[PDB]
């Protein structure tokens, strides 16, 4: 039975990096050539493996980030997305694939539905997802649920706009992590 | 509430200085903390940022020479500047960057001067006259910057233009102080410029006469 | 990636409307901030292009999304006279060149004075010739030696006067005593709007 990669890649709606989606691909056969030979990808970075196997489980994590932020979807990277949104491990065996989504995820006036965490006290551990909407305490006084000075909402929108520069344009990113699944 | 900067001074090319930003009303660890510099007469430039999680980013000019640091116990942010160069001469500002909400809290500033020059007091020469008349003193060949020029021990305050100082190839500063006076008074009134350069303990009183 | 603040210098009077424009090379949406610096620490006025920071007067407004952004002061007030900077809100923060808002006044022609090198300095071996332009902002000084000068000149401009709202400029021509002794006529030619024709003040060495 073929692996359901189309569902992840051709999904109508992707998710915010803060709440990235994970699809477990198990008990299936997969041709990775079709994906590589699509030619629709800006980034096809594979770490620990060549273009060419067999793995216990395959995970397909998917989200939307800016183009200037795809660099952070790699092992050993630092930044707001890597540190506080999605982290790839230093020991990473897998492939990171990406494409521009301006036509789909950008709206005149801006798309305020894709959010990110700008505020977190600590860097995220690998493959951790924080979906907390708690108000951040940037100072001594406890925030107590009220936004204000030193009391701020941790999640912010990208406001993707079609006139945005490509680096600030939305990119759809699928991370294939290799941990039932074999090539043809 | 307040961000207080300290540590600025005079240093020579290749030297090292550490600047401190002491915070009240914000937590340095809980916030994105930034260093911004204003080269003299040139406007604002970013240098570095420490993130809440420890991630440090630096501007390409200061990349292998500067390190941003924090002490949560003292609520203090630091910039260690090493391999300093003349181009690193500026007023260094510390700020809290709420990234999408702007850099709201800023510090007063600390001045860093990097020069190969040595403290020298001013050589004061007369700028002398030939309607209205102009007479002046040239304060020349001095380092470091603070210079004060007064006329008639503070009694001549009108028509006085003490000009901003310029930096010469020598590495030394020169300024001019001028006063416009009635042509008639030139033979009736004494005009003495009183110049102080506290760095060399040089006080000079020079009489300008036609 | 490139931010250009267009009116580097602006002249206006209290109650006037002042518009400052910041242009980005590429679309940055609403990611811009506006700051004011009096000669002392920049102050944040506007974040997200249109949002006022608390306490900032309503006379202050932000507009723009994408490539072109503008800061507008509805009625300039005495304390609003200062320098204004646009910042791009990005992981790599960028600031604009800056805009200085200055008090407008009627055109005042400069008073031009030339001061010859002091005999005391000439003993040292350097000659400094000084030209004063008093109570005039755009002015041009041309040093001419024997009707001929570039690269031996430096100049300074005073900040606007509290009472006359005018500017003063000083220029120094630095020459070796030996070079000074190789020419006779030393002049300062000044071009300003108030001057209908350029004014030259000259001295002949040794009179
Ligand atoms: C998505 O749709 C295209 C339609 O031609 C198809 O070729 C592709 O296999 C689908 N899935 C993937 C993996 O992109």
Author numbering:
A (entry chain E): 334 to 385, 390 to 516, 523 to 527
B (entry chain A): 2 to 131, 138 to 217
C (entry chain L): 2 to 40, 42 to 99, 99A, 100 to 137, 140 to 151, 153 to 211
Paper text:
Of the seven antibodies in group 1, five bound to the receptor-binding motif surface mimicking that of ACE2 and belonged to the class 1/RBS-A/RBD-2 community antibodies. All seven mAbs in group 1 contained minimal somatic mutations (0.00–3.51%) and had standard HCDR3 length (9–18 residues), which aligned well with previous reports. P5-1H1 protected against disease and body weight loss, but had moderate effect on reducing viral load in the lungs, consistent with its reduced neutralizing activity against BA.1 in vitro.
